[PDB]
Design a binder for this molecule. Structure first.
Ligand code: MG
Ligand code: MG
Ligand code: MG
Ligand code: MG
Ligand code: MG
Ligand code: MG
Ligand code: MG
Ligand code: MG
Ligand code: MG
Ligand code: MG
Ligand code: MG
Ligand code: MG
Ligand code: MG
Ligand code: MG
Lengths: 116, 104, 155, 50, 203, 119
RNA sequence: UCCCGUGAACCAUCGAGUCUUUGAACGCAAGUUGCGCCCGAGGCCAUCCGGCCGAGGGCACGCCUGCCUGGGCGUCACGC
RNA sequence: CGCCCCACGAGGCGCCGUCAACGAGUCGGGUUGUUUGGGAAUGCAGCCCAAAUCGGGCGGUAGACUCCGUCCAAGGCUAAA
RNA sequence: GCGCGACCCCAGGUCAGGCGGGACUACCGCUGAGUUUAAGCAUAUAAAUAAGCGGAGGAGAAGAAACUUACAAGGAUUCCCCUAGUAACGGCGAGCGAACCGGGAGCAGCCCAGCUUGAGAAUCGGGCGGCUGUGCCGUCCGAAUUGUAGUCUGGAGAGGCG
């Protein structure tokens, strides 16, 4: 040996392959789109945002992030979000402002579900 | 199970007889009841007690024969009659005796 | 673990070893051990595999021939309690004690017992080697009770 | 403060949902004894202590 | 039949043969941690008589405990009390060092069950004990009729309740007659019984 | 929807009804949002319909899951018997019955015999 | 539609299920929904037959039985 | 109620006298502290000393000898009241 | 230029497992006061108690004499009555304080270590496969001779004969 210092020799670690699964039942996706998008908001402030800013206001799950909101609005309503802005409301629910890419029309999206 | 006659200890009571724990090995062997069979047929044993005086030993021997005389034993199976078993007539006349069947 | 073991042999060196424990440290030679271990290798006990077919074979001898006919197989004897028993009955003819038994008290008194009972005894080097003969990991003692009539001279 | 944690914001939200007078129809149920909300809180009179 | 010889030599503890073997072992023990797994009993014959078997699930550990008494652990040796309780430094713990060791193993080895223990060595500062522990989850234990009793729930932490051999010693249960009658069922059970005021219905 | 009419179906068909009952629930949230009056009380029906279908798929999947592993294979932690921690750690009746050779000879020879007196 | 029946119910009862975030609390923390790593069903292209977003799920500590990987003239045998 | 029939193994019992193994820093003693109704020291614990095998522990006053009664520690399990 | 075998240690998100925490009526272990009483107070008493630290079960603990007794002796443990406010202990003050005998409730005794397989580890775990599935069978690895099984536990027992 040249070094005076004895280090820990490195050995093999074998990976896990258990003889029975600790979980048989699969995972349901409990935050699916209907959990993510609960219901659109119909406050007069929101109805302004539809015309003036091409925007849609939803009440969303408290555990949904901006990315999943973008995905779920494409599966449901088959549209595109240019930008999603969120805030957790003073009473505990999360509100998402969805801006549609300028292809789609927010008013026509508003009509196809019924808000205006 | 059957208890033998013993004298009490201590001057104040040595003139009084009472039930003891169990028969000694000599009392069991003199009456011809094997050591490891007695608890199985209703007779307690005491590997600790001693026989220092002949009369006490004689008294407890007679109890074992008196008990053996009025003891009846059912077979271990239905029809096989091995040693120590009894006649069917005996086993129908048999009831659960209650109280002190051998008073002291 | 390395540090303590090296000092353990060094501290052993420095201290005065009393005679009973220094009666080891005088082992049988290499020349004689190769001679002795040649004999022991002849009398290895029956291997695990070497043991199940004969019991399979003696099934037929019992099931049809209705006789057991296998004759006395002759092999070395081992196990400390067994060898001590053979020694005190004087059925032992050669005792083979490993120098490196730990705890040593298991064998310290064997030299005295074999000397008092007048059986030849040797101290070979390596308990792991004795265990190899009998198909164990270590053995710590061996003894040959009886040799075949072909090896009286060599024995 | 304006700088708060999510955990404190969560508890403050629940405290607001609980400052409401009881529904009127509760007063009509069979074998009812609730008169008013006996736990109403006012920010200037009783502090939350959290 | 070799266990008789090894036991007799261990009786002769002032012989030079035993003084040398123990002196070197005491050196090494002092060089190891206070609670160490060991592969085989160093006193196999003393282990045999204490119920140890060479079976899977039996483990032996070596524990080191300190020697001496129990100084009162108070902030400066200051006692706020009557002069009868003001002593500090000649007081003695009521459990023997054997009991202290088996529970040190017991707490650390929370998954195993203490069976017995036995002295191996000592010097002026430490005493060394080897504790026989049992894996009551091992199937080679659960199928042994002689040791199944240790798997029942009523035997959890026997050493912490004073129920091993050392526990039976400092509890005064080695002995039977007068001179020991207050220790059975327990010293505190005896005290409670003698304290009771029995007010019968017709009195 | 009825419990019986779901237990007698195929896996994919159960998945459909979950999907569409889920869609009907999403639209009923919006009347509450906008309108009122009468269909506000289909939510409780639809909400329990989803739960009932979820129960059916789930209760079914364990019957298969147990069946596949009920070759007395190693069982998953979610399919093993949860009774109490104490019960699971007991000894088996066969283990509690292991007796020693000497003690069980004490029963082959010299069992406790049936006897009477006065004879 | 639930009324001579798969059948109401703030009904009783219990075997089938679900069971958010935590807590002995277990990936590291915590006046933080803060900070890592690993696996990975599913989908996209091809900068490979690889890489990209993944649904879900792991990664605490001590201990026992077995195993795999390895270390030290500690004791040997055999060599070179 | 039915079929299966227990053994050359083990056990009981009768004699024999040849053997007859039985738990160690443990017991035991001193000293210290605690505890007890336990009083020349009831149990327990520290430290020191440290066993025996015609031997060991007891017989509520410390001590030596002769006899006498008594039990066999230092490993473990065990219902019911 | 090696490959050995064992010893003692490693590191593994290795296969499979068991640990910790909670509740306080009663149970087991440790530690541990002072108020108070003594018409003051210090040993004593309060008390081997309260508080403190732990460990269990449905009961727990104890239990089969290295026991008592002094008798014509008895015979595991626990609980009740009695012994008994007694023998004893105690600034012999204040106070404190059991046990044996006897009578009841309930009764039950067991198993190891060691000389004692040596023609033969006859024992045990695990993977895998099968089936009658709380287990049994086959097979392959391993534990263990520094000792698994069987015998045996002083009441005995090994032998021998019948
Ligand atoms: Mg924001
Ligand atoms: Mg103010
Ligand atoms: Mg104080
Ligand atoms: Mg004292
Ligand atoms: Mg007990
Ligand atoms: Mg104390
Ligand atoms: Mg008071
Ligand atoms: Mg006063
Ligand atoms: Mg006063
Ligand atoms: Mg005063
Ligand atoms: Mg308390
Ligand atoms: Mg108990
Ligand atoms: Mg009176
Ligand atoms: Mg008192």
């Amino acid at each position: 040996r040249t070094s005076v210092t004895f280090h820990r020799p490195k050995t093999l670690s074998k990976a896990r392959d258990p003889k029975y699964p600790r979980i048989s039942t699969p995972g349901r996706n409990k935050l699916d789109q209907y959990q993510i998008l609960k219901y659109p908001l119909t406050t007069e402030s929101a109805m302004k945002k539809i015309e003036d800013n091409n925007t849609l206001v939803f009440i969303v799950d408290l555990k949904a992030d901006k990315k999943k909101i973008k995905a779920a609005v494409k599966k449901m309503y088959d549209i595109q979000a240019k930008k999603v802005n969120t805030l957790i409301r003073p009473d505990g629910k999360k509100k998402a402002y969805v801006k549609l890419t300028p292809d789609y029309d927010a008013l026509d999206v508003a009509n196809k579900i019924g808000i205006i | 199970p059957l208890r033998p006659i013993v004298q009490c200890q201590t001057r104040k009571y040595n003139m009084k007889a009472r039930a003891g724990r169990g028969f000694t090995l000599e009392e069991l062997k003199s009456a011809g009841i094997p050591k490891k069979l007695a608890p199985t047929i209703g007779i307690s044993v005491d590997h600790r007690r001693k026989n220092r005086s002949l009369e006490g030993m004689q008294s407890n021997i007679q109890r074992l024969k008196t008990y053996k005389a009025k003891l009846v034993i059912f077979p271990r199976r239905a029809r096989k009659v091995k040693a120590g078993d009894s006649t069917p007539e005996e086993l129908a006349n048999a009831t659960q005796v209650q109280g002190d069947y051998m008073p002291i | 673990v390395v540090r303590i073991q090296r000092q353990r042999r060094i501290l052993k060196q420095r201290l005065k070893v009393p005679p009973a424990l220094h009666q080891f440290t005088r082992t049988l030679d290499k020349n004689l051990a190769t001679n002795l271990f040649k004999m022991l290798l002849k009398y290895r006990p029956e291997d695990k595999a070497a043991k199940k077919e004969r019991l399979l074979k003696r099934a037929q001898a019992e099931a049809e021939g209705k006789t057991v006919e296998a004759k006395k197989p002759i092999v070395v004897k081992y196990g400390l309690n067994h060898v001590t028993y053979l020694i005190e009955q004087s059925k032992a003819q050669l005792v083979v004690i490993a120098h490196d038994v730990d705890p040593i008290e298991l064998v310290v008194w064997l030299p005295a017992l074999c000397r008092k009972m007048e059986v030849p005894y040797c101290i070979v080097k390596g308990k792991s080697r004795l265990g190899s003969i009998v198909h164990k990991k270590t053995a710590s003692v061996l003894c040959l009770t009886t040799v075949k009539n072909e090896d009286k001279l060599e024995f | 403060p304006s700088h708060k944690t999510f955990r404190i914001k969560q508890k403050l939200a629940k405290k607001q949902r609980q400052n409401r007078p009881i529904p009127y129809w509760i007063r009509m149920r069979t074998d009812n004894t609730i008169r008013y909300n006996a736990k109403r809180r006012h920010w200037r009179r009783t502090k939350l202590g959290f | 039949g070799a266990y008789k010889f090894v036991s007799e030599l261990w009786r002769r503890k002032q012989s030079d043969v035993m003084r040398f073997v123990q002196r070197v072992r005491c050196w090494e023990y002092r060089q190891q941690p206070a609670i160490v797994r060991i592969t085989r009993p160093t006193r196999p014959d003393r282990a045999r008589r204490l119920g140890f078997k060479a079976k899977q699930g039996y483990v032996v550990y070596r524990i080191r405990v300190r020697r001496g008494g129990r100084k009162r652990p108070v902030p400066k040796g200051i006692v706020y009390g009557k002069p009868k309780h003001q002593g500090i430094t000649q007081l003695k713990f009521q459990r023997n060092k054997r009991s202290v060791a088996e529970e040190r193993a017991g707490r650390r080895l929370g998954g195993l069950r203490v069976l017995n223990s036995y002295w191996v060595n000592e010097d002026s500062t430490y005493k060394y004990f080897e504790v026989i522990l049992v894996d009551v989850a091992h199937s080679a234990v659960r199928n042994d009729p002689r040791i199944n009793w240790l798997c029942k729930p009523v035997h959890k932490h026997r050493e912490l309740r004073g129920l091993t051999s050392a526990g039976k010693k400092f509890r005064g249960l080695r002995g039977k007659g007068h001179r020991h009658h207050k220790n059975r069922p327990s010293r505190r059970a005896t005290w409670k019984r003698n304290q009771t005021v029995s007010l019968r219905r017709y009195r | 929807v009825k419990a019986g009419e779901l237990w007698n179906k195929s896996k994919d068909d159960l998945t459909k009804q979950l999907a569409e009952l889920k869609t009907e629930l999403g639209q009923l949230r919006i009347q509450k949002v906008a309108s009122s009056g009468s269909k506000l009380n289909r939510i409780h029906d639809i909400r329990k319909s989803i739960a009932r279908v979820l129960t059916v798929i789930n209760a079914k999947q364990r019957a298969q899951l147990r069946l596949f592993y009920k070759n007395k294979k190693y069982a998953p932690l979610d399919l093993r018997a949860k009774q109490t921690r104490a019960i699971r750690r007991r000894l088996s009746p066969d283990e509690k019955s292991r007796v020693l050779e000497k003690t069980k000879k004490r029963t082959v020879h010299f069992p406790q015999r049936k006897f009477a007196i006065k004879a």
